[PDB]
């Protein structure tokens with residue numbers, strides 16, 4: 001397949017055609033990273049929801065595979081859709097689905113029932129009901145068999161929340177080493193509350209605790225996750241819940257986004273750290289401060305220092321209307337997950353997790369240093385559509401802002417600004433004049449994330465640009481900002497801008513990135 005379309009990210013996953021949303025079933029197994037995803041095999045917007053499937057050895061060079069869970073009745077009257085979920089390698093065959101070949105992979109997902117019906121298990125379900133079901137694969141995830149005999153395995157939300165049967169979804173299951181139990185985290189979406197269950201066999205589930213609400217509650221809670229992360233450089237660890245909400249995303253955005261909580265987990269209860277929850281219902285820990293980072297899900301099958309989340313690089317506010325063809329939506333750059341103590345606070349730090357050395361030119365197309373960069377904008381350079389920018393500069397600068405203007409027309413009336421506001425100590429991304437902004441009135445906006453300078457007073461930004469995206473990693477990765485852009489064919493120019501004064505100790509480098517397709 002030829003992936004050379006305008007706006008087609010060359011180092012972000014997207015399906016060859018049709019609509020994609022949430023990443024699902026993230027599992028590393030026998031050297032392969034599986035990426036399943038909410039997928040419409042019959043259209044360019046949300047519908048006929050199925051689990052699509054792609055694989056890579058390196059989180060970088062993806063190969064699209066056959067649909068893994070195809071909406072039941074697809075092409076006819078659809079009776080079951082496969083909403084979001086997760087997957088594990090049941091290597092000891094606790095499920096009993098293994099035969100005389102490979103031990104099974106097991107997917108746990110939300111069954112959505114568009115119509116009232118009686119299922120092969122004998123259970124009766126209502127119109128628009130959401131329940132938790134499982135499927136298994138004996139060919140390393142290529143094909144899947146749904147557990148018809150007993151699905152759904154968690155039919156109902158916990159008492160007293162039975163009324164929430166239409167909004168009970170997104171199971172994240174994992175093997176908990178410490179308690180030797182399968183643990184699943186689900187969302188009672190409208191109540192902003194997670195329900196946690198345990199199992200010895202992936203089929204029979206017991207409710208063990210509930211978490212939340214805390215912090216951001218301005219939208220339905222979705223896509224919960226729970227992972228143990230290393231803290232700093234020693235043997236300390238903490239558990240982290242990631243969860244999305246829609247709408248009620250980060251400050252300065254309209255629509256969906258991703259928050260997190262740092263704490264501890266004993267096999268049944270997640271206890272938030274005292275400093276991770278804030279009085280009231282607005283202030284939150286944001287995984288990403290931009291508009292386009294949602295349904296962030298973690299990989300199963302990875303070790304302590306190797307954890308990776310993948311996010312959907314779109315926003316429910318306008319996602320249906322982004323000007324892409326013949327596909328719609330991409331995943332963000334995979335995010336390596338860790339914690340660092342920053343300003344006396346355990347803080348999520350992300351690293352851009354791709355095989356950069358396999359696709360990045362070693363010689364920068366642009367490389368300059370300035371003891372003092374003059375107020376104004378520098379000479380123009382040409383970058384193409386796919387590149388990385390490294391910037392570092394002094395927080396003590398007299399300028400009001402320092403930024404790179406990128407994906408710009410030659411006269412810079414079309415451009416995306418990525419920079420730092422010195423007084424506010426914030427990263428900003430201004431996509432107000434970034435190209436096509438016609439499809440939603442909220443798209444043409446400026447976004448902000450907090451970034452305190454390091455101990456040496458240096459501010460560092462790493463910026464990844466692809467055909468329709470910009471991702472900023474600030475500092476060590478403690479602040480990320482992810483935003484789509486839709487620039488014209490000529491929008492391949494860049495320059496530096498020091499506004500309102502000079503910028504001190506500037507270092508700037510740009511490297512071209514090749515296609516992964």
Ligand SMILES: *[C@@H]1O[C@H](CO)[C@@H](O[C@H]2O[C@H](CO)[C@@H](O)[C@H](O)[C@H]2NC(C)=O)[C@H](O)[C@H]1NC(C)=O
Nearest residue numbers: 019040041042043044045046047048074075076
């Ligand atoms: C769900 O998939 C079906 C196909 O199974 C889509 O139905 C139509 O798709 C085309 C419109 O783009 C038509 O040309 C087809 O004739 C028609 N196909 C059938 C069999 O009905 C449908 O649009 C999909 N739903 C969504 C929301 O995208």
Ligand SMILES: *[C@@H]1O[C@H](CO)[C@@H](O)[C@H](O)[C@H]1NC(C)=O
Nearest residue numbers: 089090091092175176177180
């Ligand atoms: C499989 O069995 C071994 C030995 O009991 C154990 O270490 C491991 O945790 C089990 N489960 C998985 C998922 O590997």
Ligand SMILES: *[C@@H]1O[C@H](CO)[C@@H](O)[C@H](O)[C@H]1NC(C)=O
Nearest residue numbers: 377378379380381382494495
């Ligand atoms: C800007 O760069 C171009 C291309 O390298 C060069 O020709 C031109 O002289 C430069 N302009 C100034 C004023 O430095």
Ligand SMILES: *[C@@H]1O[C@H](CO)[C@@H](O)[C@H](O)[C@H]1NC(C)=O
Nearest residue numbers: 409410411412413414488490
């Ligand atoms: C900038 O250039 C574009 C063509 O790339 C042109 O359409 C537009 O008029 C220019 N704007 C100004 C103010 O010169």
